Design an enzyme around this catalytic site. Structure first.
Site, PDB file in Angstrom:
ATOM      1  N   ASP A  25      20.210  22.316  27.895  1.00  0.00           N
ATOM      2  CA  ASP A  25      19.808  20.796  27.513  1.00  0.00           C
ATOM      3  C   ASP A  25      18.279  20.668  27.054  1.00  0.00           C
ATOM      4  O   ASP A  25      16.982  19.936  27.708  1.00  0.00           O
ATOM      5  CB  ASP A  25      19.917  20.455  28.911  1.00  0.00           C
ATOM      6  CG  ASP A  25      19.031  18.928  29.821  1.00  0.00           C
ATOM      7  OD1 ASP A  25      19.970  18.046  29.361  1.00  0.00           O
ATOM      8  OD2 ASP A  25      19.043  19.286  31.514  1.00  0.00           O
ATOM      9  N   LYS A  65      18.629  18.258  21.188  1.00  0.00           N
ATOM     10  CA  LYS A  65      20.406  18.335  20.141  1.00  0.00           C
ATOM     11  C   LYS A  65      20.282  18.731  18.922  1.00  0.00           C
ATOM     12  O   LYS A  65      21.537  19.530  19.077  1.00  0.00           O
ATOM     13  CB  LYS A  65      20.726  16.474  20.677  1.00  0.00           C
ATOM     14  CG  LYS A  65      19.419  15.523  18.926  1.00  0.00           C
ATOM     15  CD  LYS A  65      19.623  14.551  19.099  1.00  0.00           C
ATOM     16  CE  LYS A  65      19.270  13.536  18.605  1.00  0.00           C
ATOM     17  NZ  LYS A  65      19.484  11.752  17.677  1.00  0.00           N
ATOM     18  N   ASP A  95      23.978  19.824  28.170  1.00  0.00           N
ATOM     19  CA  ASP A  95      24.255  17.840  28.403  1.00  0.00           C
ATOM     20  C   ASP A  95      24.227  17.569  27.278  1.00  0.00           C
ATOM     21  O   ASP A  95      23.269  17.476  26.190  1.00  0.00           O
ATOM     22  CB  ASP A  95      22.652  18.083  29.005  1.00  0.00           C
ATOM     23  CG  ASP A  95      22.934  16.534  30.039  1.00  0.00           C
ATOM     24  OD1 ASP A  95      23.443  16.255  30.313  1.00  0.00           O
ATOM     25  OD2 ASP A  95      20.896  16.216  30.936  1.00  0.00           O
ATOM     26  N   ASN A  96      24.496  16.013  27.649  1.00  0.00           N
ATOM     27  CA  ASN A  96      24.122  14.728  26.697  1.00  0.00           C
ATOM     28  C   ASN A  96      24.294  15.181  25.013  1.00  0.00           C
ATOM     29  O   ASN A  96      24.302  14.273  24.081  1.00  0.00           O
ATOM     30  CB  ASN A  96      22.399  14.586  26.190  1.00  0.00           C
ATOM     31  CG  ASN A  96      21.838  14.387  27.356  1.00  0.00           C
ATOM     32  OD1 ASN A  96      21.167  15.745  27.883  1.00  0.00           O
ATOM     33  ND2 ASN A  96      21.553  13.396  27.973  1.00  0.00           N
ATOM     34  N   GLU A 104      21.983  10.162  32.853  1.00  0.00           N
ATOM     35  CA  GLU A 104      20.869  10.233  34.900  1.00  0.00           C
ATOM     36  C   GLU A 104      20.951   9.116  35.081  1.00  0.00           C
ATOM     37  O   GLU A 104      19.700   7.999  34.218  1.00  0.00           O
ATOM     38  CB  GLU A 104      19.979  11.096  34.209  1.00  0.00           C
ATOM     39  CG  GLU A 104      18.806  10.899  33.102  1.00  0.00           C
ATOM     40  CD  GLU A 104      19.637  12.271  32.062  1.00  0.00           C
ATOM     41  OE1 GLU A 104      20.846  11.939  31.797  1.00  0.00           O
ATOM     42  OE2 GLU A 104      18.520  12.743  31.137  1.00  0.00           O
TER      43      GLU A 104
HETATM   44  N1  LIG Z   1      13.841  24.058  21.274  1.00  0.00           N
HETATM   45  C1  LIG Z   1      13.386  24.285  22.337  1.00  0.00           C
HETATM   46  N2  LIG Z   1      13.010  25.341  23.114  1.00  0.00           N
HETATM   47  C2  LIG Z   1      12.935  25.283  24.909  1.00  0.00           C
HETATM   48  N3  LIG Z   1      12.431  24.355  25.243  1.00  0.00           N
HETATM   49  C3  LIG Z   1      12.257  22.980  24.374  1.00  0.00           C
HETATM   50  C4  LIG Z   1      12.790  22.832  23.243  1.00  0.00           C
HETATM   51  N4  LIG Z   1      12.460  21.402  22.334  1.00  0.00           N
HETATM   52  C5  LIG Z   1      13.085  20.761  23.608  1.00  0.00           C
HETATM   53  N5  LIG Z   1      12.475  21.804  24.646  1.00  0.00           N
HETATM   54  C6  LIG Z   1      12.354  21.399  26.204  1.00  0.00           C
HETATM   55  O1  LIG Z   1      13.687  20.649  26.105  1.00  0.00           O
HETATM   56  C7  LIG Z   1      12.824  19.998  27.568  1.00  0.00           C
HETATM   57  C8  LIG Z   1      14.204  18.942  27.394  1.00  0.00           C
HETATM   58  S1  LIG Z   1      14.063  17.656  28.997  1.00  0.00           S
HETATM   59  C9  LIG Z   1      15.275  18.768  30.013  1.00  0.00           C
HETATM   60  C10 LIG Z   1      15.191  18.676  31.630  1.00  0.00           C
HETATM   61  C11 LIG Z   1      16.413  19.976  32.106  1.00  0.00           C
HETATM   62  N6  LIG Z   1      17.200  20.498  32.240  1.00  0.00           N
HETATM   63  C12 LIG Z   1      16.655  18.977  33.852  1.00  0.00           C
HETATM   64  O2  LIG Z   1      18.356  18.152  33.239  1.00  0.00           O
HETATM   65  O3  LIG Z   1      16.040  19.169  34.324  1.00  0.00           O
HETATM   66  C13 LIG Z   1      11.538  19.139  27.359  1.00  0.00           C
HETATM   67  O4  LIG Z   1      11.057  19.544  28.272  1.00  0.00           O
HETATM   68  C14 LIG Z   1      11.467  20.006  25.847  1.00  0.00           C
HETATM   69  O5  LIG Z   1       9.903  20.482  25.841  1.00  0.00           O
HETATM   70  C1  LIG Z   2      15.255  10.279  26.391  1.00  0.00           C
HETATM   71  C2  LIG Z   2      16.602   9.688  26.294  1.00  0.00           C
HETATM   72  N1  LIG Z   2      15.923   8.416  25.685  1.00  0.00           N
HETATM   73  C3  LIG Z   2      17.633   7.673  25.676  1.00  0.00           C
HETATM   74  C4  LIG Z   2      18.921   8.508  26.387  1.00  0.00           C
HETATM   75  C5  LIG Z   2      18.667   9.524  26.398  1.00  0.00           C
HETATM   76  C6  LIG Z   2      17.602  10.313  26.074  1.00  0.00           C
HETATM   77  C7  LIG Z   2      17.703  11.821  26.760  1.00  0.00           C
HETATM   78  C8  LIG Z   2      18.262  12.320  28.041  1.00  0.00           C
HETATM   79  C9  LIG Z   2      19.072  14.098  28.284  1.00  0.00           C
HETATM   80  O1  LIG Z   2      19.539  13.825  29.640  1.00  0.00           O
HETATM   81  C10 LIG Z   2      17.759  14.674  28.186  1.00  0.00           C
HETATM   82  N2  LIG Z   2      18.100  16.082  27.965  1.00  0.00           N
HETATM   83  C11 LIG Z   2      17.173  17.147  27.646  1.00  0.00           C
HETATM   84  N3  LIG Z   2      16.781  16.721  26.124  1.00  0.00           N
HETATM   85  C12 LIG Z   2      16.719  15.439  25.932  1.00  0.00           C
HETATM   86  O2  LIG Z   2      15.588  15.251  24.590  1.00  0.00           O
HETATM   87  C13 LIG Z   2      17.214  14.286  26.425  1.00  0.00           C
HETATM   88  C14 LIG Z   2      16.958  12.869  26.088  1.00  0.00           C
HETATM   89 CL   LIG Z   3      22.257   9.984  38.678  1.00  0.00          CL
HETATM   90 MG   LIG Z   4      19.246  16.171  29.162  1.00  0.00          MG
END
Ligand SMILES: Nc1ncnc2c1ncn2[C@@H]1O[C@H](CSCC[C@H](N)C(=O)O)[C@@H](O)[C@H]1O
Ligand SMILES: Cc1ncccc1-c1cc(O)c2nc[nH]c(=O)c2c1
Ligand SMILES: [Cl-]
Ligand SMILES: [Mg+2]
Length: 213
Positions: free
Chosen positions: A139, A142, A167-168, A197
């Site tokens: 998560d 992508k 996720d996603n 979410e």
């Molecule tokens: N290569 C990488 N390694 C570690 N963290 C990364 C990354 N690329 C992005 N991220 C981190 O991934 C996160 C995505 S949002 C994560 C949401 C969390 N899993 C939840 O559900 O509460 C961000 O904080 C971003 O800084």
């Molecule tokens: C930011 C955003 N905008 C529109 C649609 C979806 C998202 C979105 C939603 C997520 O749950 C994500 N989780 C991990 N990392 C992401 O980059 C991320 C981005």
């Molecule tokens: Cl939700």
């Molecule tokens: Mg996510």
């Protein structure tokens, strides 16, 4: 302040210390009523909860911590002695996540690893004393899902039955990862359709169980 600091302050002022469920509810409320944020959320979170309960993993790796919502969600369901490692590249978010875990009373079960997943994954065996992983929650970003899956395998971190939960896979979407795991005889895949979410937008989780080489 940042959005992330505002979420932490809302939890501190609207939840009960040591009560994980209250923490999740506060974050959900804030992100529904005030400011959207990319936590996995309650709809997909309920699917995660069902998966964690089915497998009772001893060692979970999370890629992407953010504010600690998913770490709280998973760690609250772990058995005594079971552990979560969470990798987070952004140091401001690592600091928020630590405070969120502390507030929830889950700090003993969770370790933050600072850095990029692609840099930390190769250190898990020797530096962090990991043998194999029982579950991985993807998560972070992508475009890293497929390369980091392949890296986990290269490093010897997967075993027969390791559960990958991504996720996603619809929004933003991870087409190379989905095509690869769904086409591979080395994974058994299931799709769990849900919602982004806090929004009335379709998304989904993929579960991909590693089968061996
Ligand atoms: N290569 C990488 N390694 C570690 N963290 C990364 C990354 N690329 C992005 N991220 C981190 O991934 C996160 C995505 S949002 C994560 C949401 C969390 N899993 C939840 O559900 O509460 C961000 O904080 C971003 O800084
Ligand atoms: C930011 C955003 N905008 C529109 C649609 C979806 C998202 C979105 C939603 C997520 O749950 C994500 N989780 C991990 N990392 C992401 O980059 C991320 C981005
Ligand atoms: Cl939700
Ligand atoms: Mg996510």
């Amino acid at each position: 302040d940042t959005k992330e600091q505002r979420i932490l302050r809302y939890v501190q002022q609207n939840a009960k210390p040591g009560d994980p469920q209250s923490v999740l509810e506060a974050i959900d409320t804030y992100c529904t009523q005030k400011e959207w944020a990319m936590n996995v959320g309650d709809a997909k979170g309920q699917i995660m909860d069902a998966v964690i309960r089915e497998y009772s993993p001893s060692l979970v790796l999370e890629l992407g911590a953010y504010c600690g919502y998913s770490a709280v969600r998973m760690a609250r369901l772990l058995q005594p002695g079971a552990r979560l490692l969470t990798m987070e590249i952004n140091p401001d978010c690592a600091a928020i996540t630590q405070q969120m875990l502390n507030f929830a009373g889950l700090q003993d079960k969770v370790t933050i690893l600072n850095g990029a997943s692609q840099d930390l994954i190769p250190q898990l065996k020797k530096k962090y004393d990991v043998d194999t992983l029982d579950m991985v929650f993807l998560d972070h970003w992508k475009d890293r899902y497929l390369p980091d899956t392949l890296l986990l395998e290269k490093c010897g971190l997967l075993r027969k039955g390791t559960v990958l939960l991504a996720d996603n896979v619809i929004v933003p979407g991870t087409p190379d990862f989905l095509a690869y795991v769904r086409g591979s005889s080395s994974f058994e895949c299931t799709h769990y359709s849900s919602y982004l979410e806090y929004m009335k937008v379709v998304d989904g989780l993929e579960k991909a169980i590693y089968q061996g080489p």
